[PDB]
């Protein structure tokens, strides 16, 4: 039941560097590919099956493909504190940078590295015995994450096809932004992501900054702070396969009970409780208020008000010792709650997965050791507003043909520009027709 | 190789700018309150068959030519402007300039030849509703040259009476002939600056 | 080989199917009827050519 991971772009590889540390801490693996000699095991010899594999003598290696073109962060990992853990060959670093250019990421440089990463993917899959799905981690606002990521998505869909894909992708914020030419890359990668990735999970830099500002009490957060709770969210998502869950949901429950239409797969994410040490032991963490904070609009990784839309469906993964009576009462309270409104055609729309593993703590972190945690993945219809606002940004740039020559100097024409535009328009129409 | 060692430095970005021409039958092009145009594109502006929609909620499909000319055009505000077709016909020099059908809101339905407005051209213009039936308020055929039609024309009043002559919407002192066809009399003379100044009234 | 009775019976079946699909949703029936009429005119042209 192993799950493989692909990290594309500098953002993806940084998230992986900050997330595989969480995995190697959860499964008690020393940060050099081994277990401690003394019995310091939470329990089980296969809780780490989904991510690692023993080789002769306790030398586990992660099922990760860290693919990036420009080799400044790949070799940063290579010389970091994880050297005897990672596989020397999985860490694929190209020759030159993609430079915010979907063209250079997808046609010029991508074509000579996709077939090099694909063989390692094939070897990992053949080694795997019960492969479950793909988890992609990327940034649409850059070159390698958008271009190379979309190319790899297409060339894995053409080959494996049936297997599920979970794409954690970051988008630019409505106001806060770093790259100038990010709308072009965002729309171009969105067109590819629409019909290939099975389930798309969305992240936003400012939407994590403001949470780290209002909850974790940090007025100067950073990427090394966002990536930690991103790792927390993905761990909350994947804990069901790992640990013994009384009411647990494998990877296919997300697609089975949260994708009513194949076109509609775009999901808000939330995670409670985002608390630090100072207020942790002063507050009381209970399944009522943690869930309520999950469903409040101020604790979402996607900067978007769910008020403007209707929650189509939702999944709630619970960690720690939680008794199902309280979560059933909590979802009853949510159904009686007024502000959030559902489309009337879904009477039952709450999947409640539960596990028996409490959330982990990383030394030097911000979050503290807690009893229980909740991850809320909601297929709502407020994400059409996100796509429409990004499109309205794109229109002004495309009207004056700005930055277009950089793109078209490579194999990219204007036909795919227009087709990505109309694809986003069709997505807008679909979301609005879902409507009432 | 010889491919690299070629006069390509300046030429690379020159050909990139050329390839950024923004032409070809794009699937669509959008703005904010802009000219949503779908169709063939060349010469950096609308050129070729295609439909254009814009702020006036009027979705008209025609043959674009760089906006220095235009082919057959069908201009209409259907079920939103609430009118089936407002203009239908070929264009030349960004003007119909030929066979054209126009439909006012309720004023009239003009099907005829005309170049740069209705300043010249021979055709028909039923200035009344119910054009399928004789109940039409009137039917005029001849040379338009302004709102004052200013030419040799002829119109039927739908009561059977017909006018045949020179016309400046009236009152051009042009020798005309008018037929009381119902009665059986006819008046030939000069509509001098009015419905009547002189002439001869006779018995067909 | 072609037979007028075969054509008539198949046309009747198409009418019954389009009735069913219209009862489901009418727009599909509109499209099916338009497609029916279009290959009807095509076969009419072919018959004239023959």
């Amino acid at each position: 039941r192993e799950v493989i991971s692909i990290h594309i772009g500098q953002a993806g590889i940084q998230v992986g560097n900050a997330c595989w540390e969480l995995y190697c801490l959860e499964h008690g693996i020393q940060p050099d590919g081994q277990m401690p000699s003394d019995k310091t095991i939470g329990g089980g010899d296969d809780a780490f099956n989904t991510f690692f594999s023993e080789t002769g003598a306790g030398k586990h290696v992660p099922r990760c493909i860290f693919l990036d073109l420009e080799p400044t962060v790949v070799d940063e990992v290579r010389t970091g504190t994880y050297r005897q853990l990672f596989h020397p060959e999985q860490l694929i670093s190209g020759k030159e940078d993609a430079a915010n250019n979907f063209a250079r990421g997808h046609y010029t440089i991508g074509k000579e590295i996709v077939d090099l990463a694909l063989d390692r993917i094939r070897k990992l899959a053949d080694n795997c015995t019960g492969l479950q799905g793909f988890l992609v981690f990327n940034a649409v606002g850059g070159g390698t994450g958008s271009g190379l990521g979309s190319l790899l998505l297409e060339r894995l869909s053409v080959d494996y096809g049936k297997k599920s894909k979970l794409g954690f992708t970051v988008y630019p914020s409505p106001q806060v932004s770093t790259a100038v030419v990010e709308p072009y890359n965002s729309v171009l990668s969105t067109h590819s992501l629409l019909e290939h990735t099975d389930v798309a999970v969305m992240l936003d830099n400012e939407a994590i900054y403001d949470i780290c500002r209002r909850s974790l009490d940090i007025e100067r957060p950073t990427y090394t702070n966002l990536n930690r709770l991103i790792a927390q969210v993905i761990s909350s998502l994947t804990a069901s396969l790992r640990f013994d869950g009384a009411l647990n949901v494998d990877i296919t429950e997300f697609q089975t009970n949260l994708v009513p239409y194949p076109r509609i797969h775009f999901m808000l994410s939330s995670y409670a409780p985002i608390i630090s040490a100072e207020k942790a032991y002063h507050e009381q963490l209970s399944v009522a208020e943690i869930t309520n904070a999950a469903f409040e609009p101020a604790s979402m990784m996607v900067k978007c008000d769910p008020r403007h839309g209707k929650y189509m469906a939702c999944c709630l993964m619970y960690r720690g010792d939680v008794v199902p009576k309280d979560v059933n009462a909590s979802v009853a309270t949510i159904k009686t709650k007024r502000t959030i409104q559902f489309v009337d055609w879904c009477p039952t729309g709450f999947k409640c997965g539960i596990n028996y593993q409490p959330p982990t703590v990383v030394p030097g972190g911000d979050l503290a050791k807690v009893q229980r945690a909740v991850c809320m993945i909601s297929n709502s219809t407020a994400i059409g507003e996100i796509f429409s606002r990004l499109d309205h940004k794109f229109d002004l740039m495309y009207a004056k043909r700005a930055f277009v020559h950089w793109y078209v100097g490579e194999g990219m024409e204007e036909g795919e520009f227009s087709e990505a535009r109309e694809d986003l328009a069709a997505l807008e129409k679909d979301f609005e027709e879902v409507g009432a | 190789a010889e491919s690299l060692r070629r006069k390509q430095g300046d030429q690379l970005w020159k050909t990139s700018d050329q390839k950024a021409q923004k032409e070809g039958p794009h699937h669509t092009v959008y703005w904010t309150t802009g000219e949503r145009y779908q169709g063939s594109w060349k010469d950096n502006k609308k050129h070729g068959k295609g439909t254009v929609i814009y702020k006036n909620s009027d979705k008209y499909e025609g043959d674009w030519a760089n906006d220095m000319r235009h082919g057959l055009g069908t201009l209409w505000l259907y079920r939103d402007g609430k009118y089936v077709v407002r203009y239908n016909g070929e264009w030349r020099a960004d003007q119909p300039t030929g066979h054209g059908t126009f439909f006012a809101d309720n004023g009239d339905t003009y099907e005829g030849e005309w170049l740069n407005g209705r300043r010249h051209g021979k055709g028909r213009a039923v200035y009344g509703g119910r054009p399928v039936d004789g109940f039409g308020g009137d039917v005029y055929e001849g040379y338009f040259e302004n709102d004052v039609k200013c030419g040799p024309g002829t119109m039927m009043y739908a009561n059977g009476d017909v006018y045949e002559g020179l016309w400046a919407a009236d009152k051009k002192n042009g020798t005309g002939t008018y037929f009381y066809m119902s009665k059986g009399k006819r008046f030939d003379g000069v509509w001098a600056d009015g419905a009547i100044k002189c002439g001869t009234y006779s018995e067909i | 080989g072609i037979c007028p009775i075969r054509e008539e019976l198949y046309a009747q079946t198409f009418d019954e199917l389009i009735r069913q699909v219209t009862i489901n949703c009418a727009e599909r029936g509109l499209l099916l009827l338009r497609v029916r009429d279009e290959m009807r005119m095509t076969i009419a042209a072919y018959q004239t050519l023959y």
């Binding site: 069709a426 129409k429 027709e433 | 068959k49 499909e61 | 949703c25 727009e27 599909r28």
Partner: peptide
């Protein structure tokens, strides 16, 4: 199948035929 799907089929066929 959806009503949006069928109306978009109408639009697509008409656009492809307007050549």
């Amino acid at each position: 199948a959806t009503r949006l799907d069928v109306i978009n089929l109408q639009e697509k066929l008409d656009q492809q035929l307007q050549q």
